Design a protein around this ligand. Structure first.
Ligand SMILES: CCCCCCCCCCCCCC(=O)O
Length: 162
């Protein structure tokens, strides 16, 4: 009744650097349909703060404009799962990553989430890496997704992806 798959041995210090949202999938169309939807977030980079926590700088369409956005993902007992401030706990779990080339993550609710959830295939360079997109699918095969987006190299370079 949640997201089952996670990353064991997650060194959140080897995940740091630049990242590109190549694909995103949500359990509901409304979460990802328009540019203004809430979990239509593009990911600039991950900064692992000294003391574990992860800092995301990201891009969203908020009104009219691609706004940069800094967010703080707070480590939990489980290396792969982090927590975002706050209203009702938004948890991020890292499904999979090879650190160097791709990263699979999902965000859901601690309510819990029957059954709302956004996921993303972060990559390092602006390229269609199909061997991570294949991994994105097979980890979404295990889940209730009703929208998948994916982007090109040219949209991977603009802010909010054109
Ligand atoms: C391992 C970390 C992967 C990157 C996680 C970033 C996702 C957090 C986005 C939270 C949504 C921001 C907009 C909002 O709160 O309305």
């Amino acid at each position: 009744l949640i997201v089952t798959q996670t990353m064991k041995g997650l060194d959140i210090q080897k995940v740091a650097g630049t990242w590109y949202s190549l694909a995103m999938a949500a359990s509901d169309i409304s979460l990802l349909d328009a540019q203004s939807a809430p979990l239509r977030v593009y990911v600039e980079e991950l900064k692992p703060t000294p003391e574990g926590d992860l800092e995301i700088l990201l891009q969203k369409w908020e009104n009219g404009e691609c706004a940069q956005k800094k967010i703080i993902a707070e480590k939990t007992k489980i290396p792969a799962v982090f927590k975002i401030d706050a209203l009702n706990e938004n948890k991020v779990l890292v499904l999979d990553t090879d650190y160097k080339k791709y990263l699979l993550f999902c965000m859901e609710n601690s309510a819990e989430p029957e059954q709302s959830l956004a996921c993303q295939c972060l990559v390092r360079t602006p390229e269609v890496d199909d061997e991570a997109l294949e991994k994105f699918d097979k980890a979404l095969k295990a889940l209730p997704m009703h929208i998948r987006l994916s982007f090109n190299p040219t949209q991977l370079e603009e802010q909010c992806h054109i």
